Ligand binder design. Sequence first.
Ligand SMILES: *Cc1c(COP(=O)(O)O)cnc(C)c1O
Ligand SMILES: *Cc1c(COP(=O)(O)O)cnc(C)c1O
Lengths: 378, 399
Amino acid sequence: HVGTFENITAAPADFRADERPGKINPVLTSVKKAEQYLLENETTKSYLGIDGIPEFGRCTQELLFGKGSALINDKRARTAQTPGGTGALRVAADFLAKNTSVKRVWVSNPSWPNHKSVFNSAGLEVREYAYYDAENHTLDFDALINSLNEAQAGDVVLFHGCCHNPTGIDPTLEQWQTLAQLSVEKGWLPLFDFAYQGFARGLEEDAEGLRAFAAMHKELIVASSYSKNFGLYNERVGACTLVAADSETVDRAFSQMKAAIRANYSNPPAHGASVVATILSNDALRAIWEQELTDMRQRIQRMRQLFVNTLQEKGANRDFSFIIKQNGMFSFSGLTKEQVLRLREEFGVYAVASGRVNVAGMTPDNMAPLCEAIVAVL
Amino acid sequence: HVGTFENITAAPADPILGLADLFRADERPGKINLGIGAYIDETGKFPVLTSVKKAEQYLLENETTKSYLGIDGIPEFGRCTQELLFGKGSALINDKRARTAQTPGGTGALRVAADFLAKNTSVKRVWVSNPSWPNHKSVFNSAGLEVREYAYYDAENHTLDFDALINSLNEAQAGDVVLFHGCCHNPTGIDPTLEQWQTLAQLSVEKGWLPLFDFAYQGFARGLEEDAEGLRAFAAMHKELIVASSYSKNFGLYNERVGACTLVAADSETVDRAFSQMKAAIRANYSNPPAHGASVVATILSNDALRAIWEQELTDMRQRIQRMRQLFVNTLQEKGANRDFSFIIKQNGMFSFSGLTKEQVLRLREEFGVYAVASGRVNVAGMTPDNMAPLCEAIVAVL
Ligand SMILES: *Cc1c(COP(=O)(O)O)cnc(C)c1O
Ligand SMILES: *Cc1c(COP(=O)(O)O)cnc(C)c1O
């Protein structure tokens, strides 16, 4: 008989091996405290509900919309704990494809590559809208508006809550508000990918764009992640939050969302979400975490400044000031594929061929050799 | 405009989780939960195993990072999984024909296998036993596959209709997937004998089926190595098969979502090519798997001493369920049940088809606060010497 696995096609590809001296690319204290508390107080591993820990959902909605939000008081939002932000995006995609007339999702160009594959996995067409002005390293707002002209009512338009991946360029509050007005007028269904809350300016300031939409819309979806702002990457801690016009509608929709989860992974992993709930619902433990998050934010910004300065010190004629204005861990360096290729093979400095760099991996000890490598390929 | 969510139809009730939520809300104190498969101790608790608590303490004091695992998870987790499934020194491991991905539970392993097949092969159909775990159909349909049923259970005699099983599976074509329960068939508890397994493997290789093994209860039938004999008979013959296994129950790690999806192909090149598409299907689902539960499982299986504590804990779970099965039958007789319940002794695992009708199951819940699945399936692992008497009284009252 012919083998089923014979007609399968290899998967195109998405360091670690090369032994060259000096190649260039931890758990939070609050998380360790939380885990200790769980080790000695947990008495069972019984299945969570399909939607996970209820307190995890309450604290998620408060982070997204603000304590006392009209969405919370009117009980218009339902939150399911999911395996990571990615898992939240997949659950939303399966829910939309199975239960609604949604067939088309619009994502920024450029964007996180996994957006298209997650929505495609549910049979949803993914279109791109304009976003990045590579000339000025700014948000091309005019082109963004123009390119969303063909997004029909009932289409999903995906927005990054803050720290746009990969450009690090976010709409201003006024741009957010303009987008919120336009979104209501054209009947779009907003979906926010909110994976870096707290890494731009702060917890509350980073949710301003989402809350501008939340104030205008009857319906929206938020796929949030705690992988980065809690350092809980491999524990897979995220949330998919549904918002509808009223309590009866969101509950009706949320039961089909839970049906989509049941047929995917059944119920979500507890450990990571318990940590987050333990921290968020404890005043002193939350104060510790919030300070760790502020520390992380300021360190990245500090490295952004040092990166720019050392590029100049080491003789770069190109102006990299735009790195200071960009938010989060990722910025487009502006290096060509041919310039990135050299860094990988000729300097042990590894970056994506698109020239995206990860400020997280920069330190005061590797900054000098790193910048000396970049100035060489310029 | 009109809201996108305005016309969504409410989802129907889950046959298992629908009753579970209802049990959580029940006001009566004597309520008894015989619904969802979860091991309980005689103290009325669903405890964490001691082996697990020790491993969790090790992780707490030694883990220095939470950085993403690979798409396929912890390497040592995959190797220990293949040892349990196929046995240390198997030809599949030495020939490097097997690739394992850590998944969120055995359910997640089923969906990953289903997505992988739906998106990378010509598979359109999955054959599932009648009866079977209710969520099998939901998992396969959501990935785009049809679900067909093949004969299995003799209700009147409480046995496995092996002849009806083979005849029904003649409608299955080459390239179609056939799902087999490794051990402790859900919900009947009736597993094929080794000779019956070897006949299915023989017949499977001939018809060209793609065996899919759901292996959620390894160790609860007779023993770790013994419970894998059916699978290993298929492995010795087939060039290709898939195994979705779970550690939720044999490690008591239900809510950490610890499972594995293992691909087996003819040679190392074919499995690696197929496995790259499995990882792609995983990337577009949950990206990478949760570490805590799998780290616990890997830590236990890799330490000889810690493994011994666990394998003794598992052994204590298996034979305590065996003691409840015997007590269940003996108490039914003492409480006035006239019919023969001896078939319950022959059944393996946590679950047993009690023969109760849908209406009788409804009565138990409303009038007696005893919660079973509408199929008549009962969770023997939820019975205790203390709740056995009231639950048997309730059952006899509705007979
Ligand atoms: C990292 C990232 C995600 C996924 O986060 P996880 O919780 O690890 O799944 C989603 N969207 C963006 C933009 C990201 O950068
Ligand atoms: C319980 C069960 C599962 C689910 O295993 P999880 O690890 O909880 O996802 C899968 N298959 C069968 C037959 C089961 O009984």
